[PDB]
Curated annotation (Swiss-Prot), chain B:
It comes from Homo sapiens. The keyword Ligase does not apply. It is found in: Nucleus. The keyword Nucleus applies. One of its GO terms (cellular component) is nucleus. One of its GO terms (biological process) is negative regulation of double-strand break repair via nonhomologous end joining. This is Tudor-interacting repair regulator protein. Changing K2E: Abolishes interaction with TP53BP1. Homodimer. Interacts with TP53BP1 (via the Tudor-like domain); interaction is abolished following DNA damage and TP53BP1 phosphorylation by ATM. Interacts (via the cytoplasmic part) with SDC4. Interacts with TGFB1I1 and PXN. The record marks K2 as: Required for interaction with TP53BP1. Residues 105-192 are annotated as: Interaction with PXN. Coiled coil: none annotated. There is a cross-link at K2, K138 (Glycyl lysine isopeptide (Lys-Gly) (interchain with G-Cter in ubiquitin)). Keywords: Isopeptide bond, Nucleus, RNA-binding, Ubl conjugation.
Amino acid sequence: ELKQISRVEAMRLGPGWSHSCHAMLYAANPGQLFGRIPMRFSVLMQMRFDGLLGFPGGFVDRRFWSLEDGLNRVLGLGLGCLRLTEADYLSSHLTEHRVVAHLYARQLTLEQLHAVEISAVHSRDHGLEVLGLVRVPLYTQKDRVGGFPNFLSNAFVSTAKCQLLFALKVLNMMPEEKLVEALAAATEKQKKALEKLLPAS
Amino acid sequence: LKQISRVEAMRLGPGWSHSCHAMLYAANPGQLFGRIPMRFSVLMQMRFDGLLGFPGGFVDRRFWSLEDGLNRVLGLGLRLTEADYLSSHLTEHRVVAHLYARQLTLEQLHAVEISAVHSRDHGLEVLGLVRVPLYTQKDRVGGFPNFLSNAFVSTAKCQLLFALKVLNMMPEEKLVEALAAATEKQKKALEKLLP
């Protein structure tokens, strides 16, 4: 968990602080997987050029643009679709490189969520800085790792993983105890996989 | 994984089930930020169970050929043939994993990505396609090592590293280096959580 800070207090930090803006785009999903698993929500993340999962967005130079303007410019290159606004602002966090990470989020219709994925494959950043969008599975299968735990066992931008788990909580998309349960299962999954290659003694 | 030939795979007997997966890749002459050659782009997919793997799935050899079955299960919205067959491996519950591979042009690879986002499997069994970055940045983790530190279907990760070698897409010593750096990354990060 990262240290949180209000927007107005974040925008008065000295010139030694850089700002980032990322967007969590998600849609309520009424479907079920394999006839019994409710999907609840579909959330968009993406594979970055450095091989890590993160959110759409990136560095925003506050000197030249509003946070919203700068985020939408980035989204224009990496998604090429919509225009977020201050109403979509969710949180600001301090990262450990003095960076203030601003998190935006908007619930989309399922139709627009799919339209974003379609526009992403045609975007300027596709195949360069963005290597592909992925939906987050929020369910957990009977084996207690399938789905969200396995997904959390992937390799993330540290800030993005914190943001994802934070947003799911405060947006009442997943109970906090279920988020931490899945994170614990992910960590035990990572240990199970690592032991096969490089076990401790 | 213990490898076996195609003809010997089909004589494994009815007790063995067969899976078929496709590694679609393209030569990539681009350079990331104008410095680092991308070499090749390979398509993988995020699965319903949160793991990265290859398109494809199980095939019922009593009703489809391996190639016909594969083509129905790709979940990409190209038709693979016998010549695209690459290797067969025996999974670590009697499953023979057949791996098919075909080199495409980058533009054709892009066309598969565009068709994939419109497939009926999208948003249920397939949660998205990703391109494998085969470059390694100067920090020794950026790109391919970080990518290999994600979570894979165990067969898919072995199929990827095997295919990259035998197809002469990456020298073996570079594949070992990238895997080693990814595994060391996983260890150090895991030590922050479960020392």
